[PDB]
């Protein structure tokens, strides 16, 4: 079953049960690039509700719309923001580069729902263009995915990491520069580096919220105020702030805000920096936890996967593999974002959909993996104290402890001999004319090296 | 409704209507990264059928499996390749970096269907690992998406472009180097550059099929032949060739084939080169067709979108915008592919899922946009002969025609004067002591400049 | 002539006239990657002086060094910072990933100069490692290239752009979205978008100075305080602040500061955002200024290059071409910086030299092109008022001016007719039953559209 | 001292001792971007000689030039190709995007040398433009850097790797998937993966020579034959083949050859694939060789650097660090190459200099590091047989050897017990009711696992 409808290019069969109109139906059959996987990112659909709902309130204020119509659009708009009318946004990312098609998608459905509870162009899109409106929906959603989704789960990741940092603070281990044996440090200090990276990462993405706080709405087709009442920007950007719970200003220069999306390239660059930080932590942990007999085996990773009896003690760091796979995706997504970010042309940058998609995709992926990694990995890591101690005493790096109370020549003879024999520093000092067992400890205490 | 099942980690509720087992159900709830949008690329699911079906035939040959079991797995396997059991592969891309989870997904469902028509590990995964098997499914699918989807639609794109090249072969236009006015060329020659780029692009991706022709299957867990009958590689890689319609060899060095996916980085690099070629063509056309009054307006683009009566003759090059958005995505996807491509570790590269996904995503997107662009744009472009001629005679570049039959001094005086007055070369030559109207044409014929 | 010298690996011939020692000479012949073009970035050489000079003062304070030796190292160190001993740093970028070789290069020469006015390891490298020391020289130089070189020239670029913005503020022009004809805006408003982008760019790079303000010095070999007197970090990072004129703190977590260089990836990401902004401005200007007869020709670009008499009025936007070439290089350099930025391993990231080089190379290039572009292009741009006006009246976009004082039907008939005839809105309104000449102006004033 | 000279823009002081003219001097002071480090890549300067020398021969053939003039230009041109007049090419990369300035640089000096032994434009640049000529110099140099520099040193790298592969062919070691313990393989097989990667890399770059074989020369300003004698392309591209020793054809479509440099993006993509291959090999070796007591220490790396007596047996894999730093640079350089590669505009791509520079820079760097790494690392690597054997017997993976001659239950009890006790499989089997010492060997022979 269908339902004939009109636009301008004439008659067209629109599905009976869907809330969209002709324009959405015609564009849906013109840009089927990528299939359902590329279906316009949901958190962007929800932002249209917030914007259209807000568009109603602020235009009704300026007396441009009849209150009855408003109360109708508002409810319908907030039901989008709610997530009930998600199946009515079938449009893909690779559509018009200005996001015109999805904006018209929002209007058509928020219009047909308003009726049910009238005009797609004159009412819902009143005092707005497809140009100022889209880059406003980008900033809102992005801000919401970060403040509400990312940041929260990013903090948990830091706390869970800091707990273990506290938990392994007494365990002294060997440092590895150039992958080689180095002087000691606590395993807790090792993990406090991971914690600091995560912390910095939070401030980096939290800071990005600032460039996103500036909204284009009010600049219409070219950044010029035309077809808008004076102060609409300030009112709408104020109305949206009250609707989201976040503070949003209007863009100081409406041209810069439409002609380019530098605020996305920045933010992406911050997420990109975070991805580097998480790659290092995830690779370390999997190396540190590798084994059981032919690897570091310093840490013991949880076995969230079912193991074969024939291979006991074998656990693949699958939460590390999934995390590192995510991280790379972001590096690639950011790459895609910067080229598109330089491709603006005159008054408008027609690479919006592809930019905000990769940005939204990066945020979703990060949050999911950050969560998955915390719960399924870090929240259960435990130290292999016997292995760690085994490897401390076998190393020749703790030879500098003797140096002041022995002399460089004797201490090197100890190291030189122990290396050639494949014996420990204690054993070497003893077989040689150096010191005693109940004295070696008097001077070579691991925890006496900061 | 559910259905309790077993694996090793115990009991687990598996949906009643789905064909998968415990392992798939446990992993599905451990790696929900990205949601349904990241759901493992379908053409990869289909390749598992081809491989498992082939795994049956070749293992039955080596006498390792009971014929009854085989006939069962075969039908079930080919029903995956068919696309009937697609809703039973709910796994995402960011799972185990070896693709183990999706391979086990294929086995569990091809096993439960086999019954219905028995063992997930001993029968379906017989003589194969999750390590040699996955990079084999990557090459098969990729090869199939290119030979059957891409290349075909890429040729049409070239033919449609070459038709117009032939069609506008008589139309002489101005060349634009440094975006400035230059000597003439036919609009057909302009379009024959687009055609050549497309042609080169085809040979570039067609050539990539070669590195993909080499299959890992037979190398098991580390590239070593262990747990495989001798010649299984040659038989299976032969059996798969007969099953796909394409020629596939087995990889000469099974280690290089598991430890790294350089064949994906190459192919991606070829798709990446193609994307550059299509960006240039798409941008040209939109500039060439811009207007109506304040742009080049050399070409007239189809109006596939409904236009407002108040703005006649206005047509946004929406098939150009969608195409360029696609192209950038590929540049980004390739970026993501090269880092992952260098991150192999020892005997295995655990960045497989993310690599083949971006590769499959690039191919789908390209084909879709290549099609969409042909039909909705190039297949209807028409020249604005009056505009083109208007701009030919206004230019001062056709001044070199007079040079031999006049002299450098006179010809520059013509150009110098016409520029200062904002008059044409004809008008200038006449008001000055140079030549006649019925003689100017005798020497300045546009089509006398190769 | 040479000069035999010693280290440990024995005898080696060191050039007679050079100030370096054995280690520098041995490494110079082991890593000749890239030739003189890759010779370690000078501003990095100068920073070593600042650091070594400061290393002297602060270690003399802690009583670790004899005042005579100090006064000697100080003068020699400041002569490096001065730029007199530049020809004594022959080391390339692709050397040890920790920057050990260049640090030892600084020590050897600052030692042999100190003599002349003693120990390379015990005196100049006193209380410091090649690990904490290098990432400190990176931050200092980078901070100095930005505060002293970049930012300054970036502001001039903004002022020169804002002057012209003021200068063309009265000139009304047509807007170009989707490259198509749109509603009007002043050319000054167009240029105020360029100005805003530049302004944002400054705050973006100026902000990056913050992450760079944190110095590693004091963390030695692993981020652990070992082999350093307590408070050396705070004193040295304080002494360096007084030496540079810039405020520098010490890194809160010394591990994060050696294991990763996220502060470079961030800053680079900011320079990367700036490059996008400058690409758009530079491309616009060259398109806007293209012609003379077959292009926009809205602006008139300076002719800094010698033109052929036969081709008058032809000027290639060579300062635009050089600028856009620079911008891309930065996009590539940033790419190189992010991979290296994720490749840290345990306690140390051995991809330092390559990271800070690309960062320094980006800053130099930007400043040079920003300067070159200002002086040789923007500082002389002038508007082609007659062309601009010619194109305003030819467009059909100023049809919405009549709308309120005429009606949508009449106004579209004007537009519909004028389009078909290739006539202006004025001419169309007149030949049709619409309005008068001395009334058309009463309602269609360009500067009545915000 | 100087020497006044003329061009068109008037008088200018040209250094007395330099061979260039006005145009070079004026451009040298207009584009000083990056300083001497960005000085136009030498192998590009040499190619101009080959081209100009060839331009002489072929134009003299077509009777366009006086033999006396030719014999003069030829000698002067070949002295550039020789490398004697290198100090007369002071131009940087960021100049005119068409390479016009360096082409005019070649002409001015090859003209002033010709005299000494006449016209910069009419003689040396006869029958050629700055447009067809530059992308011809790019292909020639690139082809020469690969055939003569890269490929050769790349083969040595493969042979040196294959020698060691043969040398360690008897040594059985443990495999490491997911960084975990796996089934055995010879260290020679491990190194045969490195060898195969290198081999594939050679064919990949060798293949790229093909797209580069097509030369633009003959297409002049727009790809149109104008201002060229018929067959000049075929003659010149033939004359150049005889001059270089390599086979070069002329480009089939001269437009595609000027409007875009896809052949550089391809080749770069091949070098990019090679860089991934070399990163993996270099990282493995440094991990495999890490230690002495707290790392793998499977291999023993040469100590090309002077070591401190206090730290015996410590050797930093500095040839690995330099190699990996190089590899990343290439990944970045390729990135820079692809954006520039999509930025072609109409008839000409004005991003030539920056594209061929990064390409030449990548080739130089690769060759240098490939050499440095071979000689200073691989050509001296030796196995630590006692460590390898130590780690073989400690692993529980060789438990599948017993399986057929014992049963899954017994074999797992052995593995289960040995794991819990931290004892070897031999010891476990003995203390348990399983088998004997002089029988354990009868079944568990390492070299019985392919």
Curated annotation (Swiss-Prot), chains A, B, C, D:
One Pfam family, short name: Lyase_1
GO CC, one annotated term: nucleus
Knocked-out gene: effects: Cells accumulate extracellular fumarate.
Outcome when changing residue 119 to R: Abolished fumarate hydratase activity and ability to participate in DNA repair
EC code(s) of this entry: 4.2.1.2
Compartments (UniProt record): Mitochondrion matrix; Cytoplasm; Nucleus
GO molecular function: fumarate hydratase activity
Gene Ontology annotations of biological process type: DNA damage response; double-strand break repair; fumarate metabolic process; malate metabolic process; tricarboxylic acid cycle
Residues binding substrate: 98-100, 119-122, 129-131, 177, 309, 314-316
Family, similarity comment: Belongs to the class-II fumarase/aspartase family. Fumarase subfamily.
SUPFAM superfamilies registered for this protein in UniProt: L-aspartase-like (SSF48557)
Protein purpose: Catalyzes the reversible stereospecific interconversion of fumarate to L-malate. In mitochondrion, catalyzes the hydration of fumarate to L-malate in the tricarboxylic acid (TCA) cycle to facilitate a transition step in the production of energy in the form of NADH. In cytoplasm and nucleus, involved in DNA repair in response to DNA damage: following DNA double-strand breaks (DSBs), translocates from the cytosol to the nucleus and promotes DNA repair by catalyzing the dehydration of L-malate to fumarate.
Protein name, as recorded: Fumarate hydratase, mitochondrial
Highest taxon of source: Eukaryota
Reaction equations catalysed: (S)-malate = fumarate + H2O
Site-annotated residues for Important for catalytic activity: 321
Residue positions where Phosphothreonine is found in the record: 393
